Symmetry: C2
Subunit: 110 residues, 2 copies
């Protein structure tokens, strides 16, 4: 029952999947149309993918076709990845937690 | 879809840690301002986006806080992870529609 945190994490996740889409598409383009990939690279320097909506809106001024392609790719990733995440993250934290704990307590002894 | 899932899972891990620290600091600033102010200074010196290093770093300075972060992040992790796929997937669809409509309008305008 921490909504503020759920909200901010969801929003973060949204932008991250957006970035994750741009990553895939960038690789694709680095093969197919290099000149366009160079553009995408430097575009992403001028605009933080962290504000994905501001990023996408900004892109509309330059390459509408890509925006659309991003919107699609991002949603597919979302479908493919989202459901596996809770189990995945929870046990990662658990394992990480254990290792830090056992490590920190060993330092006290040693 | 596997590589993405792992990278996302790591980020989310890293992120929830941050989010924990944040929540802890909010309380610390209400309670032990000296500690909170130190926490601030520390965060600047060590990048939270690197939790595992960020934590090991802090193990050399405030073991008691490290252990608290670990407990706190896991509480959030359990309270939040579950409602995440519905929220994000829905949130994307919604942003997706707006963006499409906006864009397709601009095209003819």
């Amino acid at each position: 029952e921490f909504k503020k945190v759920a909200k901010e994490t969801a929003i973060t996740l949204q932008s991250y999947l957006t970035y994750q889409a741009v990553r895939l598409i960038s690789q694709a383009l680095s093969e197919t149309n290099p000149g366009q990939a160079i553009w995408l690279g430097e575009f992403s320097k001028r605009h933080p993918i962290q504000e994905s909506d501001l990023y996408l809106e900004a892109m509309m001024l330059e390459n509408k076709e890509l925006v659309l392609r991003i919107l699609t790719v991002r949603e597919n990733l979302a479908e493919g990845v989202l459901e596996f995440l809770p189990e995945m993250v929870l046990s990662q934290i658990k394992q990480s937690n254990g290792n830090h704990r056992r490590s920190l307590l060993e330092r006290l002894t040693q």
